[PDB]
Design a protein around this ligand. Structure first.
Ligand code: CL
Ligand code: CL
Ligand code: K
Ligand code: MG
Ligand code: MG
Ligand code: MG
Ligand code: MG
Ligand code: MG
Ligand code: MG
Ligand code: MG
Ligand code: MG
Ligand code: MG
Ligand code: MG
Ligand code: NA
Ligand code: NA
Ligand code: NA
Ligand code: NA
Ligand code: NA
Ligand code: NA
Ligand code: NA
Ligand code: NA
Ligand code: NA
Ligand code: NA
Ligand code: NA
Ligand code: NA
Ligand code: NA
Ligand code: SR
Ligand code: SR
Ligand code: SR
Ligand code: SR
Ligand code: SR
Ligand code: SR
Ligand code: SR
Ligand code: SR
Ligand code: SR
Ligand code: SR
Lengths: 81, 46, 65, 56, 194
RNA sequence: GCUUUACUGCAGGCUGUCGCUGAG
RNA sequence: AUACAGGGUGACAACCCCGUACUCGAGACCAGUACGACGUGCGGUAGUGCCAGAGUAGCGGGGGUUGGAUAUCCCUCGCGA
RNA sequence: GCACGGAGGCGAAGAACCAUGGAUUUCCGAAUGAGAAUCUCUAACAAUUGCUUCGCGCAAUGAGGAACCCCGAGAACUGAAACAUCUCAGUAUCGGGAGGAACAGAAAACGCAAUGUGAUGUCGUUAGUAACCGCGAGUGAACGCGAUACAGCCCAAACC
């Protein structure tokens, strides 16, 4: 059984999305839909997901850009792992 | 052109394979990626 | 290592599952630290976690859960 | 217009592609038939005795 | 005393005379309107079917098959040939029509195996044969002392390998002595000269 | 490769005959 | 030494190491066979024209094939006990 | 692991390794819910069959395998110092199909003609003999014998 979240995608561009737009980025299973990514993320870090954007990368993986609600602080979440 | 999801997966794999033999493999074997490819000089499949 | 087959069998179906999630998480966090290029690693565990999970998963099928 | 070099420039059509069944780049995307394994043409695998010397 | 069967038998010795003549005249009209392979509930020549192995039992199937009459439907040579290999009109095939019929029947019923077949007439442009097929997977047959032999693995697709009565005769295996030097044990092993 | 009233054959067409095919 | 086959080991090794002879063990195949046992019941006399496989046996036209020659095997059209 | 690194870890809770059995076993693939260059779209034995509880409920088929094997389709170069019958050759190649081997096989046989043999393969021989053939070039058995291995049975019908 394949899991949805593979690991946090951590790069300069990712940090910005995290500090400036309350967004977290993840490497996810390319079979996962935007909705399955939101659900998975909410149940792993207990937060509210507002929007999810996806991209099948040239690394053969899928990258997801998850924006959290104003109640959650991306920086703090990312900092506990 | 327009690539499908599968095509893209295959292209990505080709990009990954197209890398150096790690330095440690050299030491461990005490002394060449024979499949090194160039986008221009070579031609992939499909 | 730290987790043995005997111990795994001594758990109830509910404990193996709870243990399975606890393991998957440690692994996920390891892979997260690896993604961040973090060095507080211990490569042995990342390897051990995978095995432990296969073991619990193997036991779960053997026992019927 | 020559049949050689000048006519080689008009070639930008894709025909043979990676085959789903055998993996070779022989699946003709226009005919939808693999010239290597016969996929799209037959359930059996394309094969011929002339692919080797008669007594072998 | 004579069996009722002997009467069906005796009728079919002269399919062109008596009641049988009129029956055929009627039947063929309907047969010409049917397909290439029509499964039928009961054999048309009961005596013949029972004689060949047929039984009124689960797993025993009968089908009528029609084939175009005449010689080979051969395509003329497109490349060079010496006079000898240019013929096209008088060349006939090596398998008789009954055999071609058994094979079409067996293809229609992939899971069944041909037991035997017999002729049920012809008109000016086609021939009809009925074929007895057996279900080697049905227990009514796996438990039959007279038919269970056809359930063995090596009997699979028997018709396509010439193992039928019609197959064996067409292969020249009737005679046990003179004339069978190149037919037995197989046409192939004898270099294909029989 | 090509030609033709070269040799020998093969398709194809025409024609008779038998089967399909019956009653007065 | 019932072991002087072969190999390895910083150079020509029976005796340095693996093995090698002897002896022993297991699996596969032979084979669900052979043997054994259960059941079934072989055979003979007299009478009885009750039964015993049809487009068959066989013949002819046309082909192919064969060493098959008049005397191979098969296909096809027609006739047919 | 190959693989002679670095770091770290596992092993007396007996790891590595080996044997046997089991677990897991993505997608395409006969590929089977429909479609597609390995992905997608909205519960599926698709298709052909048998049985049938007539419901895909129970089942079969499909594709693979080095060659070997069986049934069909079937060349030409070549030889004949040309070439047409013949030859190369039922070879190459093609279609279909089975198995661990296939096929054959218990006489409407043989015909060393007999007061004789006694299912069938195969091996040796019979023999380049008989037979064929622009009677040219060439093609070419069988019965028998010596071996190998041996094994004989079941229906249809009569009478029920
Ligand atoms: Cl069959
Ligand atoms: Cl004798
Ligand atoms: K020739
Ligand atoms: Mg997008
Ligand atoms: Mg790069
Ligand atoms: Mg009986
Ligand atoms: Mg010839
Ligand atoms: Mg599919
Ligand atoms: Mg010549
Ligand atoms: Mg043989
Ligand atoms: Mg001459
Ligand atoms: Mg010859
Ligand atoms: Mg003889
Ligand atoms: Na990755
Ligand atoms: Na290129
Ligand atoms: Na069949
Ligand atoms: Na020329
Ligand atoms: Na012949
Ligand atoms: Na004839
Ligand atoms: Na496996
Ligand atoms: Na099926
Ligand atoms: Na059904
Ligand atoms: Na010559
Ligand atoms: Na010449
Ligand atoms: Na000749
Ligand atoms: Na003698
Ligand atoms: Sr990259
Ligand atoms: Sr170029
Ligand atoms: Sr022009
Ligand atoms: Sr130009
Ligand atoms: Sr173009
Ligand atoms: Sr097609
Ligand atoms: Sr083939
Ligand atoms: Sr089959
Ligand atoms: Sr008889
Ligand atoms: Sr014997």
């Amino acid at each position: 059984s394949w899991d949805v979240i593979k690991h946090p995608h951590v790069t300069e561009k990712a940090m910005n999305d995290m500090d400036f737009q309350n967004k977290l980025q993840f490497a996810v299973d390319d079979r996962a839909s935007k909705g399955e990514v939101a659900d998975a993320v909410e149940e792993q870090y207990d937060v509210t997901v507002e929007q999810v954007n996806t991209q099948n990368t040239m690394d053969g993986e899928k990258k997801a850009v998850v924006r959290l609600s104003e109640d959650d602080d991306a920086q703090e979440v990312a900092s506990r792992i | 052109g327009k690539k499908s999801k599968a095509t893209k997966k295959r292209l990505a794999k080709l990009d990954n394979q197209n890398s150096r033999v790690p330095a440690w493999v050299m030491l461990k074997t005490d002394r060449r990626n024979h499949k090194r490819r160039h986008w221009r000089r070579n031609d992939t499949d499909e | 290592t730290v987790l043995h087959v005997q111990e795994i069998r001594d758990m109830t179906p509910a404990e193996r599952e709870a243990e399975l999630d606890d393991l998957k998480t440690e692994l996920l966090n390891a892979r997260a630290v690896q993604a961040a290029g973090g060095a507080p690693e211990n490569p042995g565990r990342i390897k051990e976690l995978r095995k432990a999970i296969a073991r619990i998963k193997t036991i779960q099928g053997e026992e019927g859960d | 217009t020559g049949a050689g070099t000048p006519s080689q420039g008009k070639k930008n059509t894709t025909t043979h592609t990676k085959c789903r069944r055998c993996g070779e780049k022989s699946y003709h995307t226009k005919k939808k038939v693999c010239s290597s394994c016969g996929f799209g043409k037959s359930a059996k695998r394309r094969d011929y005795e002339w692919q080797s010397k008669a007594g072998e | 005393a004579r069996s009722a069967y002997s009467y069906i038998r005796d009728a079919w010795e002269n399919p062109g005379d008596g009641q049988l003549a009129e029956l055929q005249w009627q039947r063929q009209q309907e047969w010409r309107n049917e397909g290439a392979v029509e499964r039928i509930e009961r054999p048309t020549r009961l005596d013949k079917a029972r004689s060949q192995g047929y039984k009124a039992k689960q797993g025993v199937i009968v089908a009528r098959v029609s084939v175009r009459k005449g010689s080979a439907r051969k395509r003329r040579h497109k490349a060079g040939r010496r006079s000898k290999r240019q013929g096209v009109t008088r060349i006939t095939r090596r398998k008789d029509i009954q055999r071609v019929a058994e094979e079409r029947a067996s293809r229609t019923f992939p899971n069944l195996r041909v037991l035997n077949s017999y002729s049920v007439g012809q008109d000016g442009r086609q021939k009809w044969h009925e074929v007895i097929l057996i279900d080697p997977n049905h227990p009514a047959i796996q438990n039959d002392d007279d038919l269970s032999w056809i359930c063995a693995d090596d009997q699979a697709d028997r018709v396509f390998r010439g193992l039928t009565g019609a197959g064996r005769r067409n292969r020249g295996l009737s005679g046990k002595g003179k004339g069978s030097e190149k037919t037995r044990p197989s046409l192939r092993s004898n270099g294909g000269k029989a």
